[PDB]
Symmetry: C3
Subunit: 90 residues, 3 copies
Amino acid sequence: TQYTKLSHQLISDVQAISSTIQDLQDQVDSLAEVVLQNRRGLDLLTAEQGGICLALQEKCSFYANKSGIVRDKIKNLQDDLERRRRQLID
Amino acid sequence: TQYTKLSHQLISDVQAISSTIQDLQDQVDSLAEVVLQNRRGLDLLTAEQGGICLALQEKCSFYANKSGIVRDKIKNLQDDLERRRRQLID
Amino acid sequence: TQYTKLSHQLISDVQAISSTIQDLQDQVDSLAEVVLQNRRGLDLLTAEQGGICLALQEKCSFYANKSGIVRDKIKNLQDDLERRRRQLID
Ligand SMILES: [Cl-]
Ligand SMILES: [Cl-]
Ligand SMILES: [Cl-]
Ligand SMILES: [Cl-]
């Protein structure tokens, strides 16, 4: 009874954590669309300067997206929790 | 002894993870304020064009905030860990 | 056999979660560089107005970075998982 209970608690905690990580990736993705449109906007406004990075005389920063990596890992983890719940009944 | 130890370890890990998720939401919220002010700034600069999205001739991106969802879930999880610690003593 | 198995599962879950949190911090850091360059860009374009916040007649938003806090916590957690794996063999 004790081992399955702690097993159940682990699955529940990991599920809750996984949904929260999804929420964070959801926000990062949403915010990133706004930020990259803002960069396109600044590049438009400074087109004659060659874009905002050249206007600033700076090394240019670009976004390194990992949305697919995170979403796959979370889905694969959630799929494993589904299997684990089943085996606790069985 | 073993079961409470693994129980203790689960609670400690989940607590540490939960604080790190809070940190991520803290940064997302902070960065989002900067990004949305940047959008207001671009919309001001291109007011005569109808704002930055129309100036870019693009579908307009807006931010989808989930801060309250995440913060509630984390607080509710931390509250449960508090109860679990108590029951391990009891 | 059961206790080490659930112990193993906890370590594996926490490891997977920790890597995903790293991914999120990686994206936040990358996106933050783009956002802060965008702010410098807007401040350049509105230099005569005193920068974008004064041009907007708004309280100015600045980014509160916690990258080092998160990365340390994750590395320290991963180091502990390494020790725990070893003790499960021993
Ligand atoms: Cl489990
Ligand atoms: Cl931005
Ligand atoms: Cl527990
Ligand atoms: Cl463990």
